[PDB]
Paper text:
The Omicron variant of [name]-[name]-2 carries multiple unusual mutations, particularly in the receptor-binding domain (RBD) of the spike (S) protein. There are 15 amino acid (AA) substitutions in the receptor binding domain (RBD) of the S protein, nine of which are located at the binding interface of the [name]-[name]-2 RBD and human [name] (hACE2) receptor, namely K417N, G446S, S477N, E484A, Q493R, G496S, Q498R, N501Y, and Y505H. Receptor binding is the key step for [name]-[name]-2 infection. Omicron BA.1 was found to display a broader host range than the prototype, whereas the Delta variant showed no alteration.
Numbering used by the authors:
A (entry chain A): 19 to 613
B (entry chain B): 333 to 527
Amino acid sequence: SLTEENAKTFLNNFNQEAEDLSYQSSLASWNYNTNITEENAQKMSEAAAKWSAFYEEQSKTAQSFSLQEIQTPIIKRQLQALQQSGSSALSADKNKQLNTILNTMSTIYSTGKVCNPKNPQECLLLEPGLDEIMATSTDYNSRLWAWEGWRAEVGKQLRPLYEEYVVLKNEMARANNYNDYGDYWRGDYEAEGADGYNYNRNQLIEDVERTFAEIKPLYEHLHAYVRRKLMDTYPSYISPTGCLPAHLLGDMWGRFWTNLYPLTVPFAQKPNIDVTDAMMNQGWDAERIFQEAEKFFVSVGLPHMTQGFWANSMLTEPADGRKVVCHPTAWDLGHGDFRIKMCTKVTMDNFLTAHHEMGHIQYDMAYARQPFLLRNGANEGFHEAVGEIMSLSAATPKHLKSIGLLPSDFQEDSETEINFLLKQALTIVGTLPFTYMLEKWRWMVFRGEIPKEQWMKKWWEMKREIVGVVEPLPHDETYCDPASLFHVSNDYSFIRYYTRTIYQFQFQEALCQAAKYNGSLHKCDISNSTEAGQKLLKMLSLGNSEPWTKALENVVGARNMDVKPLLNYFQPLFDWLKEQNRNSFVGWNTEWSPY
Amino acid sequence: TNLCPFDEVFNATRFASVYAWNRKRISNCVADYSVLYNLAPFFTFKCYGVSPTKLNDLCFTNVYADSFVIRGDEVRQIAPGQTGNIADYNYKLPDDFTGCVIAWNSNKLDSKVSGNYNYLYRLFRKSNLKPFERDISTEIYQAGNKPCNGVAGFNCYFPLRSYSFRPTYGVGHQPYRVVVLSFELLHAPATVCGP
Ligand SMILES: *[C@@H]1O[C@H](CO)[C@@H](O)[C@H](O)[C@H]1NC(C)=O
Ligand SMILES: [Zn+2]
């Protein structure tokens, strides 16, 4: 009769057909990613085309119901989730222009080689043959050559394309009652309708600057330690007061400092125990790795794995005849179907990847009671933060000594703890300033605070003052350095990696205080604890039916990002850095330059 | 010994939809519920009004055997005093229901790799079904306040939908064959006694 009953019937008729069309496309995508041939790639196209056509046809009609006479929150949330047409607000021609512009940057980033000032018959592309120079090569005049040649060849043609990509995306978002495209990406954290749990959009800015301003001393100490450790291999190219060069890090862009461990190590005589040489002398398999991971989740209060999982999942590489994309993923086909595609080897890195991949299955298996529009995570950082604590718990020496992998003779030591905390330091704390700086630059560019003739003028001073990284060679206003990243040449939000880290430690501290633990945070696990693990299942049952500020309150108790489990996780490391950074200068100045 | 008319409703070859459930009459025979153990591993023999634990020695004047097919997550709706989609639009049981329900998984027979679009159910209806009522109409369900004129446009949908079973679904979506026996106790000579 009224708008409420009409909307209820409309949503029922939608959910009836949507959950059957969204199954054939996912099944075709699975069959293609597992048995890629000349026919599966063509069969995967029509299913997705029909699904997209149905989705647009249903979203174009789900707009006559005014969202003003709706008093129930569930129907209102489903209508709000169905009213986001995305890029369907642009015109007919502008759509094709934006489609052909985005593909050009993608094929430019995919292809493209580099030439050296030496004999030029060696043409290197982004194939792992090139990034090895930026990962394991220590000799100078090669890392700098590669770093300059990358932004020299493929960085020049991405400038005339990004200038139109910015103005085109600013018009697509202007039709969705937004301000710009930077405000469009910030809308995922918009939670409306609650008693006190209301979260505004713009607050997302004020909550990040307040958060990054608290990990500045720890990052400064780590940066000073890395700078002092790098002066033993490059004595004449590093200044003990200035910043670090843009190259010479452990990555092509400096996003992850993980490749600096063989150089920046506290104690080199320590073995850094590995359980890889423990399944050879006793006998393991790819099924035993996924069986010891299932036993982990049933000792906490989580359901078993369905019979269709062990029969339809690809847990190893095929023998012959087939070919796979070789990427561990967890597929939620729908209709009660859950699979995992991952080529598993008998190692330690694959033993911890099974837990991270099953952390997504236990999340998908748990919100399946939602009307097909609330079957997601709270926000973009909630889904990937659940799989991180499962790998954090399964890597402790306590969990490895309770399954038969580590003998009951070696307990712990103060040196291996520091060796482990530093390797984890240059994987989490080393990427937060980079992520913050990149997202801030992209937001200011999409807004308008940075003119078109000031991009590579404010891109580098921020990297000098925020990240503490200087450029080796000057870059005039014809380059495009951020566009060299994969997440910038293709439309991808980069802030999802900043919050996911914080949520990673807010969940771990709240789930380790429900198992009666008193030691260090980096030594606790949620195994054999039903209480610590039943509070998590309460949050993993809402999807996006409730505001993310309320689902976070059910597991940790707080309504916002309050990051000081991270300062408690790296407590034995932050105290060891202050004892070493004594006869040095903690900090940098944005005035020095190598050349 | 005139044995029961069973072995023709259980071991059938073609079941019926839930919105057009089949009904069979049983009279002038001998009830022999002692061979149902050889059937599927089914975990549903749920009886109300009578006792199943070795209390099959009563005499009835008539027996009504209904049969249909549903999904695995709706077998809980075939019970006295229940709500949902099937219980309100397809098959309703009274609160004084004397008799019982059996449900067994039929994934190996009623599922297809391309989708079993044969079985149907009812999704929309103006009102709920009376106990043991049945509707087979295919009229356009007018939701709004404008006429439909026989065409299904906006706020005017078709009331019948399909199941599309597949062997890769979960246990909550795999097909289940359901048989409901109801016992009548009239003032007539009870000719259905059983050993
Ligand atoms: C159906 O077939 C099975 C097969 O063993 C048999 O035992 C049973 O008596 C038959 N009839 C019924 C009603 O189950
Ligand atoms: Zn993951």
